[PDB]
Amino acid sequence: MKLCFNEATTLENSNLKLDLELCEKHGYDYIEIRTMDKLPEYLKDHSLDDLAEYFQTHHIKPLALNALVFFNNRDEKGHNEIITEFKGMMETCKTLGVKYVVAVPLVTEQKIVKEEIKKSSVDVLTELSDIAEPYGVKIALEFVGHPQCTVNTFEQAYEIVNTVNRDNVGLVLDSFHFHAMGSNIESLKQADGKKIFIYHIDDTEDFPIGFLTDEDRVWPGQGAIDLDAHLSALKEIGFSDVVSVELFRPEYYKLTAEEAIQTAKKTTVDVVSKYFSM
Ligand SMILES: [Zn+2]
């Protein structure tokens, strides 16, 4: 299983240029690039070709672009924003050789029946799939374990992906999100491992579901998530391609970029290697 770094982990104490240097130095195989801040920032004094050249000349590679944000249940205008951004991301993936694009469900206070959220998510993901085919890029749906996220549990997200039924549409299994709204481990055990594109590892303080937010995450193994169950299930269903460490804890932004990157690696490797050869 390959090791990947998610820039959220050093959101406030690093930048893409530094993340690349340190992740490369510390044996990471992949990095997930943030499109809403890290990449634009990097592009202020670098070109996409510079970045493409970097990947061509170093071990580390770009696993995915992070977040086509709020793709489902949008009005005409919002849908336009989503499609326009995804089309733009396709060009970026092509230039940098990126394999995945993570998609995040709509977060809203509006109550929408599940069948409406499903129909919209399936229709939009199918449209994104159609767009991605000529680029060979795959879409990874990351359900978010938040009470205001329209798709917040594993089974709901899996049902959507299975209904889309496209080889280039899968899931991002994030341990925190799985735990955050109480997804059932049995649902994961019965899932097709091939539909899991990316595994985001993390952990969390033991607050009840509904109260949990991303700032509550802590390093893998230092929290209350039954990671043993998650890892055992992933192994059982055949997933084993990659694990990316994603944290949003303010506390860790107080560390240097390197301390965070090295700690993210050690905690992740020490937990995951008990189930997978890395
Ligand atoms: Zn995640």
Tell me the domain boundaries of the chain: 2-277
Helix residue spans in 97-113 (DSSP H)? none
Separation between Cα atoms, residue 17 and residue 213, nearest integer Å: 28
Cα angle 11, 32, 200; round to 5: 90
Per the CB < 8 A criterion, the answer to whether 86 and 93 are in contact is no
Separation between Cα atoms, residue 74 and residue 223, nearest integer Å: 35
Cα of 246 vs centre of ligand 1, distance in Å, is: 6
Phi, psi at residue 4, to the nearest 5°?
-130, 150
- Note residues around ion ligand 1 (Cβ under 5 angstroms): 174, 200, 246
163 CB contacts (<8 Å, ≥6 apart)? 118, 122
Q: How many Å separate Cα 259 from the centre of its chain?
A: 22
- Residue 240: is it exposed, middle or buried by C-beta count within 10 angstroms (0-12/13-18/19+)? middle
Cα of 202 vs centre of ligand 1, distance in Å, is: 8
DSSP bridge pairs for 62? 31
- Residue 161: is it exposed, middle or buried by C-beta count within 10 angstroms (0-12/13-18/19+)? buried
CB atoms within 10 A of CB 84: 10
> What is the experimental method?
X-ray
Question: Is residue 170 helix, strand or coil?
Answer: strand
Cα of 141 vs centre of ligand 1, distance in Å, is: 10
Resolution to one decimal, Å: 1.8
Cα of 252 vs centre of ligand 1, distance in Å, is: 16
Per the CB < 8 A criterion, the answer to whether 235 and 209 are in contact is no
CB atoms within 10 A of CB 207: 12
Cα of 102 vs centre of ligand 1, distance in Å, is: 9
* Topology adopted by domain 2-277: TIM Barrel (3.20.20)
The type of residue at 145 is G
The type of residue at 64 is A
Buried b (16+ CB within 10 A) or exposed e, 131-147: bbeebebbbbbbbbbbe
DSSP bridge pairs for 198? 172
Query: Whole-angstrom distance between the N-terminal and C-terminal Cα of the chain?
Result: 5
